[PDB]
DNA sequence: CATTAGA
DNA sequence: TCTAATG
């Protein structure tokens, strides 16, 4: 966690790079299983042959701890740090619809940079076109202050539209959290669960509705249980206009809420550890069910759940407010 | 790890 | 169809 840390860092660097500046999958899915496994060591790495006794720690990587453990640094990082192409690609990633194939390519034709990929927007899809439009905004953080207006027209229309729905705003939001990346909502409706097949509108009907009134507004992917846009709140009596935030809103089976609702609301941890627990419990927990274990080794049969509290209920545990669920 | 775009 | 990109 921090006799490691150096280590674990450079080696994530050292990942990071292969994977997208190269193709190198594997050296990339290297580095990542040793950057695991040399953080798990309880002491510190005194030099590369120490490390080496290490599983996933071949030479290739033992040479590279000892040169950063040597000297403060390491050239293969120095080099790359200082690589404009590799920095291109780094860049162009966090256009919003760009990841490393696009970033290659772009580059290989010569536009790395923010005003290159304007210059050629036809050279773009819709996604990282609206990507690009939006670039500083998406890039900004959502103030729960805001998280809680947004929340509120979305409750709204939910409602004006069908009173039958069940809305969620999901997330750190959901956790307390002072400040958010995006909006994410679980949509679900009881019209709508596990066979009952489909009624697309339904998730249809509510995207339309918050166009309707402005709060959509562009749409980088529909379909007919997952919607991906871009909203914004109304630009009060002037002067001040609000910023352009990502939102994602997504149908779910009745039957299906609660423990995707538990889920994606995190943290990732306290799903993690939550979901350990389930196993002793006699149980197993996963993003749409909860299902009790057969001694066999394994078992099925989804218990019935109508709230978080089902969930918790079940493996016998201490209902967690969201607030409190960070672990 | 599943859904969407797109070509 | 596959492949990429988001989460
Ligand atoms: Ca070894
Ligand atoms: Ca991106
Ligand atoms: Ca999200």
């Known amino acids: ?28 899915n290297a580095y990542r299983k040793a950057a695991s496994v040399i953080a798990k060591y309880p002491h510190k790495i005194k030099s590369g042959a120490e490390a080496k006794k290490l599983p996933g720690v071949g030479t290739k990587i033992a040479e590279k701890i000892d040169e950063f453990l040597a000297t403060g640094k390491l050239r293969k990082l120095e080099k790359i740090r200082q690589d404009d192409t590799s920095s291109s690609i780094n860049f162009l990633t966090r256009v919003s619809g760009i990841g490393p194939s696009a970033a290659r390519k772009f580059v290989d034709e010569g536009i790395k940079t923010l005003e290159d990929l304007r210059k050629n927007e036809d050279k773009l899809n819709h996604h990282q076109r609206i990507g690009l439009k939006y670039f500083g905004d998406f ?22 539209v069908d009173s ?21 909502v679980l949509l679900t409706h009881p019209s709508f669960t596990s066979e009952s097949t489909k009624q697309p509108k ?22 007919e249980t997952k919607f991906m846009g871009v909203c914004q709140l109304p630009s009060k009596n002037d002067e001040k206009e609000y910023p352009h935030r990502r939102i994602d809103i997504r149908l ?3 039957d299906q809420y609660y423990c995707g609702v538990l889920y994606f609301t995190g943290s990732d941890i306290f799903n993690k550890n939550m979901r350990a627990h389930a196993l002793e419990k006699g149980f197993t927990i996963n993003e749409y069910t909860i299902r009790p274990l057969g001694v066999t080794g394994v078992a099925g049969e989804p218990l019935p759940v109508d709230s978080e509290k089902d969930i918790f209920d079940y493996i016998q545990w201490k209902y967690r407010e969201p607030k409190d669920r960070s672990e």
Request: hydrophobic fraction near 35%; proline fraction near 2%.
């Open 202 to 223: 339904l998730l249809h009907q509510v995207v339309e509705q918050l166009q309707k009134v402005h709060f959509i507004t562009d749409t980088l992917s529909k379909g």
């Open 252 to 254: 779910i089976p009745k």
């Open 1 to 28: 966690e921090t006799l490691n840390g150096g280590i674990t860092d450079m080696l994530t660097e050292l990942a990071n790079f292969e994977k997208n500046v190269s193709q190198a999958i594997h050296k990339y």
């Open 164 to 184: 039958e729905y069940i809305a969620t705003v999901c997330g750190s939001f959901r956790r307390g959290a002072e400040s958010s990346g995006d909006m994410d």
């Open 139 to 160: 890039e900004k953080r959502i103030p729960r202050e805001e998280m809680l207006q947004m929340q509120d027209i979305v409750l709204n229309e939910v409602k004006k």
